[PDB]
Enzyme design. Structure first.
Site, PDB file in Angstrom:
ATOM      1  N   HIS A 249      14.857   2.976   1.020  1.00 29.91           N
ATOM      2  CA  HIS A 249      14.746   4.097   2.002  1.00 29.91           C
ATOM      3  C   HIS A 249      13.832   3.752   3.151  1.00 29.91           C
ATOM      4  CE1 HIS A 249      11.020   5.786  -0.012  1.00 29.91           C
ATOM      5  NE2 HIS A 249      10.758   6.012   1.263  1.00 29.91           N
TER       6      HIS A 249
ATOM      7  N   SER B 284       5.436   3.774  -0.332  1.00 29.74           N
ATOM      8  CA  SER B 284       6.790   3.423  -0.771  1.00 29.74           C
ATOM      9  C   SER B 284       7.075   1.948  -0.568  1.00 29.74           C
ATOM     10  CB  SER B 284       7.876   4.261  -0.075  1.00 29.74           C
ATOM     11  OG  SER B 284       7.778   5.601  -0.510  1.00 29.74           O
ATOM     12  N   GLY B 285       7.803   1.399  -1.536  1.00 30.78           N
ATOM     13  CA  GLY B 285       8.121  -0.012  -1.577  1.00 30.78           C
ATOM     14  C   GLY B 285       7.098  -0.886  -2.289  1.00 30.78           C
TER      15      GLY B 285
ATOM     16  N   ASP C 123      16.791   3.119  -5.221  1.00 31.49           N
ATOM     17  CA  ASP C 123      15.859   2.929  -4.128  1.00 31.49           C
ATOM     18  C   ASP C 123      15.134   1.580  -4.267  1.00 31.49           C
ATOM     19  OD1 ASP C 123      14.441   3.427  -1.767  1.00 31.49           O
ATOM     20  OD2 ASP C 123      13.129   4.938  -2.673  1.00 31.49           O
TER      21      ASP C 123
ATOM     22  N   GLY D  71       3.651   6.407   2.667  1.00 29.27           N
ATOM     23  CA  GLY D  71       2.987   5.195   3.138  1.00 29.27           C
ATOM     24  C   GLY D  71       2.934   4.079   2.077  1.00 29.27           C
TER      25      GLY D  71
HETATM   26  O1  LIG Z   1      13.932   8.729   7.067  1.00 25.77           O
HETATM   27  C1  LIG Z   1      14.401   7.986   6.208  1.00 25.77           C
HETATM   28  N1  LIG Z   1      13.850   6.788   5.902  1.00 25.77           N
HETATM   29  C2  LIG Z   1      12.791   6.220   6.728  1.00 25.77           C
HETATM   30  C3  LIG Z   1      11.455   6.140   6.041  1.00 25.77           C
HETATM   31  C4  LIG Z   1      10.671   4.995   6.134  1.00 25.77           C
HETATM   32  C5  LIG Z   1       9.439   4.928   5.501  1.00 25.77           C
HETATM   33  C6  LIG Z   1       8.972   6.005   4.781  1.00 25.77           C
HETATM   34  C7  LIG Z   1       9.739   7.162   4.663  1.00 25.77           C
HETATM   35  C8  LIG Z   1       9.214   8.366   3.965  1.00 25.77           C
HETATM   36  C9  LIG Z   1       9.316   9.610   4.609  1.00 25.77           C
HETATM   37  C10 LIG Z   1       8.832  10.770   4.021  1.00 25.77           C
HETATM   38  C11 LIG Z   1       8.171  10.716   2.807  1.00 25.77           C
HETATM   39  C12 LIG Z   1       8.029   9.492   2.128  1.00 25.77           C
HETATM   40  C13 LIG Z   1       7.352   9.504   0.829  1.00 25.77           C
HETATM   41  C14 LIG Z   1       7.014  10.579   0.055  1.00 25.77           C
HETATM   42  C15 LIG Z   1       6.404  10.089  -1.131  1.00 25.77           C
HETATM   43  C16 LIG Z   1       5.824  10.579  -2.287  1.00 25.77           C
HETATM   44  N2  LIG Z   1       5.327   9.841  -3.285  1.00 25.77           N
HETATM   45  C17 LIG Z   1       5.310   8.508  -3.118  1.00 25.77           C
HETATM   46  C18 LIG Z   1       5.824   7.878  -2.007  1.00 25.77           C
HETATM   47  C19 LIG Z   1       6.379   8.683  -1.021  1.00 25.77           C
HETATM   48  N3  LIG Z   1       6.960   8.344   0.174  1.00 25.77           N
HETATM   49  C20 LIG Z   1       8.548   8.301   2.711  1.00 25.77           C
HETATM   50  O2  LIG Z   1       8.408   7.090   2.062  1.00 25.77           O
HETATM   51  C21 LIG Z   1      10.971   7.214   5.313  1.00 25.77           C
HETATM   52  N4  LIG Z   1      15.486   8.323   5.462  1.00 25.77           N
HETATM   53  C22 LIG Z   1      16.292   9.471   5.622  1.00 25.77           C
HETATM   54  C23 LIG Z   1      15.739  10.752   5.666  1.00 25.77           C
HETATM   55  C24 LIG Z   1      16.566  11.858   5.798  1.00 25.77           C
HETATM   56  C25 LIG Z   1      17.937  11.699   5.886  1.00 25.77           C
HETATM   57  C26 LIG Z   1      18.489  10.429   5.839  1.00 25.77           C
HETATM   58  C27 LIG Z   1      17.674   9.315   5.704  1.00 25.77           C
END
Ligand SMILES: O=C(NCc1cccc(-c2cccc(-c3cc4cnccc4[nH]3)c2O)c1)Nc1ccccc1
Ligand SMILES: [Ca+2]
Ligand SMILES: [Cl-]
Ligand SMILES: [Cl-]
Ligand SMILES: [Cl-]
Lengths: 248, 55
Positions: free
Chosen positions: A41, A186-187, A90, A184
């Protein structure tokens, strides 16, 4: 990371930072000198792939200390079953344009065999999650790499103790709102110690949940992807950065 | 010794074989010792080890 501590410099040497136009995107995990595992993602919104950079040996984002190593990303590989904007499948496998140089500050995490991961690592209770993500829900991201010890739950126990988990995920952490991975992070790696060595068991994924009371962190269950990853790592690179590869 | 129980005694990876046979294995950058179970590094930066804590 919420409720953890600074990873002392060099003690998280497999942690990767991913940047897009110099801005923090996501974490990642080095598993060999040209291969990084992250979360699919992280890449849903990238327009231009040449702007994606992986950094190894990073610790304090405010400073340059000479242990950092930056590489361009030659390939982002995503399973065919992943749907952008969702949690299932993911995972991503990133090929670096040039190998990183292994040093005291840059070391890969071991990608386990599937059987070992399923039969043995899956029952190690506590594992480490790390990143430069938000220090609190709706808060600022960390300048220094943070790390957190979190306990893993069997999926039935997760569903019961919660106030959609597939076989490609697992829960870990705490339901009291004190301790979690966060936006922040994630991954990044969920790393499990067994008999003196560390292994990749999970990838920080996402959910509405950053230390949300009644909820556990959700992690991509890496054991489901070992064979898929191994096959890709033996494959030749393809033109065009993004590649969707059949899963299984 | 079976791989599903106690990891077959193996430090790292474990394969069940024809009979009451078991073979332990080690990741790249490690070799199996004569005990048949332990793995020792063969390179400077084996995976999954933290150099500043190994030193
Ligand atoms: O926008 C899209 N991708 C870009 C992208 C890049 C980098 C980061 C994120 C991102 C955005 C918000 C929350 C998290 C997050 C919450 C959370 C809780 N716990 C642990 C880790 C977590 N991470 C997150 O990682 C998003 N996709 C998308 C959206 C909507 C519709 C289609 C596609
Ligand atoms: Ca730095
Ligand atoms: Cl490069
Ligand atoms: Cl093959
Ligand atoms: Cl090929």
């Amino acid at each position: 990371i919420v409720g953890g501590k600074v990873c002392p410099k060099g003690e998280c040497p497999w942690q990767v930072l991913l940047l897009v136009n110099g801005a923090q995107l996501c974490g990642g995990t080095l598993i060999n000198t040209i291969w990084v595992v992250s979360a699919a993602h992280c890449f849903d919104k990238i327009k231009n792939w040449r702007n994606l950079i992986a950094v190894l040996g990073e610790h304090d984002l405010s400073e340059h200390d000479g242990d950092e190593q930056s590489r361009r990303v030659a390939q982002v590989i995503i399973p065919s079953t992943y749907v952008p904007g969702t949690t299932n499948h993911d995972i991503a496998l990133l090929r670096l344009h040039q190998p990183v140089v292994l040093t005291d500050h840059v070391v890969p995490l071991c990608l386990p065999e599937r059987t070992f991961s399923e039969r043995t690592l899956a029952f190690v209770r506590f594992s480490l999650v790390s990143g430069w993500g938000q220090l609190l829900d709706r808060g600022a991201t960390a300048l220094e790499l943070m790390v957190l010890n979190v306990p893993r739950l069997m999926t039935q126990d997760c569903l019961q103790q919660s106030r959609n988990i597939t076989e490609y995920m697992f829960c870990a952490g705490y339901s009291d709102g004190s301790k979690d991975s966060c936006k922040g992070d994630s991954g990044g790696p969920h790393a499990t110690h067994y008999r003196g060595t560390w292994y990749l068991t999970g990838i920080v994924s996402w959910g509405q949940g950053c230390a949300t009371v009644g909820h556990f962190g959700v992690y991509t269950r890496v054991s489901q992807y070992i064979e898929w990853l191994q096959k890709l790592m033996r494959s030749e690179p393809r033109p065009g950065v993004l590649l969707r590869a059949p899963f299984p | 010794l079976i791989c599903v129980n106690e990891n077959g005694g193996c430090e790292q990876y474990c394969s069940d074989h024809t009979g009451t046979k078991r073979s332990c294995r080690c990741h790249e950058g490690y070799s199996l010792l004569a005990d048949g179970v332990s793995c020792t590094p063969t390179v400077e930066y084996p995976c999954g080890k933290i150099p500043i804590l190994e030193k």
